[PDB]
Amino acid sequence: VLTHRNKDGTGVRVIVAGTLDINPDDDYGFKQEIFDVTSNGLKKNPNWLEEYHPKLIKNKSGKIFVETKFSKLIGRPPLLVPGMTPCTVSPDFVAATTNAGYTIELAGGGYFSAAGMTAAIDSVVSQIEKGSTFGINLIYVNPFMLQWGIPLIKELRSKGYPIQFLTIGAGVPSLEVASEYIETLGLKYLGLK
């Protein structure tokens, strides 16, 4: 185990040969692997360099993309303008940035009621192209915004709004609070800070 924690990310996989126990992490392996017949006896630890190697890849229109776990999902460059209050509040700039083909988070910080943000989200949509998308940044330390916001988001997705991810700033929700966001809101992915 000592040598294992020395090597971790490099694809070496230590097996403790003298103890038949169980590792909750599969960090390493115990006496069993040395003898197992199933493909269950051939485990390997991950090499991050290989596993998470950046790559390039081509559109049919022949665009090039920096292929990573992220962009592979989102279908755009692995780069984003994070939600920012003064800056990302403007529907104009979130449109422009998203129209330039990049992921941007509409700042919750600048809105104070479902109605006022509904105003912007609809402005953003008016300026963004067909089939395009953006996201919303809400603050945990602001239980008021979080109270008209989460609903406004869910009510909006139900109507089929192009807002397909939520990021939460200022803190990480608890398991039951997060689980709520995930299953309740119709979101493609959730962003934690």
């Binding site: 665009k63 755009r76 089939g131």
Partner: protein, 192 residues
């Protein structure tokens, strides 16, 4: 595999994915799978006992996915079909498939018309104009069929010796159905 479709900036759940969701009895036959432009997946389900084509998925000219949605139980036994059209576009990796909206309600209306209305497909009525139906003679057996269909064992509707057969007030719907339903069809009353 694409989870979502597009409709005018709005994102719907993928209808193709929906319609092909597994279940005992359905059978999918992909033909010419290895060459893209010619592939034709075909869904066949048990319809009134025997198996039959329900859905037909292929490409058309100019990158247009088509989901032929087929109804086998029709007015004349000759299957009718709803042409659902989807724009495929590889430049939007995230939402390649979007639905051709221009005239979507019209296609759905046209198929309902063939199933309900024994007339020519004309959606040019004034919603304010009276709709005349058709004359309708109540056969003794149309009544037997209807009563037994809804399960109405009233003796007033069963042929008995020395009594004329009566028709259930329910039967009014059988007579007026075509005159009534026509009323939701005009173009000025555009509905899905």
């Amino acid at each position: 595999l694409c989870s979502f479709i597009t409709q005018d900036k709005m994102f719907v759940s993928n209808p193709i994915r929906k319609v092909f969701k597994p279940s005992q009895g359905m059978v999918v036959e992909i033909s010419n799978g290895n060459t893209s432009s010619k592939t034709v997946v075909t869904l066949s389900e048990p319809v009134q006992g025997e198996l039959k084509p329900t859905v037909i998925l292929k490409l058309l000219k100019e990158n247009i996915i088509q989901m032929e949605m087929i109804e086998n139980r029709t007015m004349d036994g000759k299957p009718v079909s709803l042409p659902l059209l989807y724009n495929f576009n590889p430049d939007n990796g995230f939402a390649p498939i979007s639905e051709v909206m221009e005239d979507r309600n019209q296609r759905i209306k046209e198929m309902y018309w063939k199933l309900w209305i024994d007339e020519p497909f004309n959606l040019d009525f004034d919603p304010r104009d009276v709709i005349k139906g058709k004359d309708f003679e109540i056969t003794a057996k149309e009544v037997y069929d209807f009563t037994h269909a809804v399960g109405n064992n009233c003796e007033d509707f069963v042929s008995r010796p020395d009594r004329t057969m009566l028709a259930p007030m329910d039967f009014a719907i059988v007579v007026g159905w075509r005159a009534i339903i026509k009323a939701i069809f005009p173009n000025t009353v555009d509905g899905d």
